[PDB]
Each structure stands twice: as structure tokens, then as C-alpha cells.
Design a protein around this ligand. Structure first.
Ligand SMILES: CN(C)CC(=O)Nc1ccc2[nH]c(=O)c3ccccc3c2c1
Lengths: 188, 195
């Protein structure tokens, strides 16, 4: 488990609210305001999920071995999906393909369509480690990433993007490819 | 890290190992198959040695043993065309076929081999070969399913994140299980058989 995590008293999951003014809080704030300077951050929480982390890191080492595979991306969701995501992560079962979507810019996940405001006006987006690895442009109807070689349909790309030259979003089609690291609660 | 009974796979992240009849390993799998499919003939049995699928699955199994008898050895019949993909990548619910009677949108596994042996599942290729996997499936704690499930239901309606590990057709007498997550099943053997 990461050293910068706080003690979880032999628990496997906990949300650790960050302290403003500290490097950790500010680093995340900086990546958000970089494109969302008009929004007001209410709080930032470090998601400490021992189980999700384990599966993700296993996935990461497999990808490093099989091929710079990790990207820090954004994911805005409604309030109701937050509890599930904290515990279980991102599910494709819940358009450049039918997987989970993650934005390069926080501005993109800030849209009400994504970070849908709750009755109190709060919006939610995750700061996510995503295993984008080797990618290709996507297309609707993808249920899995395309094969690197059409004549070896089992060697797959790790993710897809909207535009390979200037990626603004990535899509992953498997469970343990995204780790929600922080949850940003913010308002207008 | 990998099972010590596995053949060397040097430099391979994966390989299919053909089993020898007369062996406990081959014979036992044959016995579980013929237990309900005595009318079919087994062409061959291959052990699936997938390093990555195994690692992920075992991490997932470790986690379900802590959170909660979570593993079942079940059958999965597929067409020939899905074999290559399942060997490398395992079972995908996004590519999963609608079951005749549906208890959710995930990958299905049978208790009896007789069930998976139906042409609708282990579809005969042009040569008449049928295919089914022997799978280690993390069923864990389960409940009766229902169509339109995209994940397992919560053990409790008011704590919607604490989920069941799988769903079945009948809790008292389970003949099939459905899993909705990627590494809850490891394809351990591939049974090729004929009429
Ligand atoms: C039908 N979908 C709109 C359901 C949904 O929840 N989508 C969703 C939900 C969250 C999303 N978060 C993102 O950062 C993002 C970035 C680029 C493109 C999409 C997203 C994004 C999309």
C-alpha cells in the first residue's frame, strides 16, 4: 500500500479528507483549476481502497511487462454513483466505445451532463489513475479494444481515444484499469 | 507465483497444455464431464496456463476470502470462434450471449456439463467439434438473479454498495451462476469433444 496513505486501522477502505494548503491538496487543486478556475472546490478526498489498488497494480505491472502506461485523468459522475465508485470503481456495464470514459481536462468532466449537481448544488469528479497504455482511435460499438494486428485478434490495444494526435478523452474496457485516487467535491 | 504443477512456459505469458488420458488430471475432468455427458466423446483436454488471468483471478479470490467457500468449478460452452479470445483474456460480459432464461447481464456458467453441451452454447464448428471450458468461478455468496441485472444486487437495499458475489437460477438448487465482473472466473481447461 502507498506510504502516503493514512493508517486505516486494519480496514480495507476509507475516505481521507485532505487538508488545504498542503502539497497534496494543492497539487490536485492545481490540476483541476488548470481548466476549472471558475469553480469552487469544497473538498478533496483521498480514496484509500486496498482491494481496488491491489487489482489495479497487478494490472499495471502486467501492462508494463507486456509493452508509460499510466495517465492521470478525470471522471465526473452524479452523486448517486459516488458510493459505488469509491468501493468498486468504474463499471462499463453501468461515443468511441462502450467502456468507461475519462477526460484529459477537468473542464470536460465538469459538465452537468457528467458531474450532475445534487439537490445541494454539489458536483463530483474523480482524479483517476488510468492504464491507457498503447491506444488507438475509437469508434462506436467497441465492446473491447481493437486488435493491434487484425490477423492476431488477441493482441489488443490497451485503450482507445477520440484523437491519437491530440487526445482529450480515453476509454477503457476492463475493470481493473482505473483507480479512483481522489474525489473532488465542488460547486459553482 | 504460478501453480507449481504447471508446465514451463518459458518466455510465454500463456500456453495450452494438452493432457494425457489415464492421468488423474485428465481422468477427473473427464469424470466430471461424462457425469452428465456420457453420450459425447472427448477429443482432447487442454490445461490453460494463463499467467496474467491467474494472477488477477487469485488476487480477486484472496479478496473474496477476506471479505466473506467462494470457488466453484463450473462449465462454459462456447463457439470455436470465441476460444482464442477466452484463452488470452477470459470471459467478457460485454460479449456475453443472452441466455435462454436470463438472470442478469454477465457471463454464465453451468453446474452440469450437460447444460453447456447444448449446441446453442458449445456450437459445433464446421468439423463437428464442440467446445466447453472447465472454469474456477468465484461464486462466493449468491442470490437468485433476474434479467436486467448489470451488477450483482446489494445484500441490503439500503447499503447499495455491499453486493452479492454472484447470482443463480435457484438458490436451493443451483444449476447455473452468473458473474458480472472481469476476473471472477479463470478458464482452467478446454474440453474439445464430439458426438
Ligand atoms: C451516457 N453517458 C453520458 C453516461 C455517463 O455517465 N457518461 C460519463 C460520465 C462521466 C464522465 N467523466 C468524464 O470525465 C468524461 C470525459 C470525457 C467524456 C465523457 C466523460 C464522462 C462521461
Amino acid at each position: 500500500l502507498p506510504e502516503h496513505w493514512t493508517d486505516m486501522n486494519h480496514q480495507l477502505f476509507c475516505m481521507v479528507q485532505l487538508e488545504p494548503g498542503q502539497s497534496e491538496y494543492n497539487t490536485i487543486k492545481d490540476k483541476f483549476t488548470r481548466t476549472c478556475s471558475s469553480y469552487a472546490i469544497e473538498k478533496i478526498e483521498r480514496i484509500q481502497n486496498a482491494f481496488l489498488w491491489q487489482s489495479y497494480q497487478v494490472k499495471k505491472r502486467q501492462m508494463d511487462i507486456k509493452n508509460n502506461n499510466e495517465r492521470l485523468l478525470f471522471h465526473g459522475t452524479d452523486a448517486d454513483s459516488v458510493p459505488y465508485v469509491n468501493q468498486h470503481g468504474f463499471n462499463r456495464s453501468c461515443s468511441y466505445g462502450k467502456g468507461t470514459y475519462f477526460a484529459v481536462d477537468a473542464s470536460y468532466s465538469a459538465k452537468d451532463t457528467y458531474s450532475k449537481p445534487d439537490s445541494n448544488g454539489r458536483k463530483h469528479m474523480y482524479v483517476v489513475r488510468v492504464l491507457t497504455g498503447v491506444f488507438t482511435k475509437g469508434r462506436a460499438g467497441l465492446v473491447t479494444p481493437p486488435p493491434k494486428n487484425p490477423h492476431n485478434p488477441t493482441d489488443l490495444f490497451d485503450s482507445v481515444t477520440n484523437n491519437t494526435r491530440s487526445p482529450k478523452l480515453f476509454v477503457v474496457f476492463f475493470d481493473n484499469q482505473a483507480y479512483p485516487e481522489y474525489l473532488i467535491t465542488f460547486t459553482a
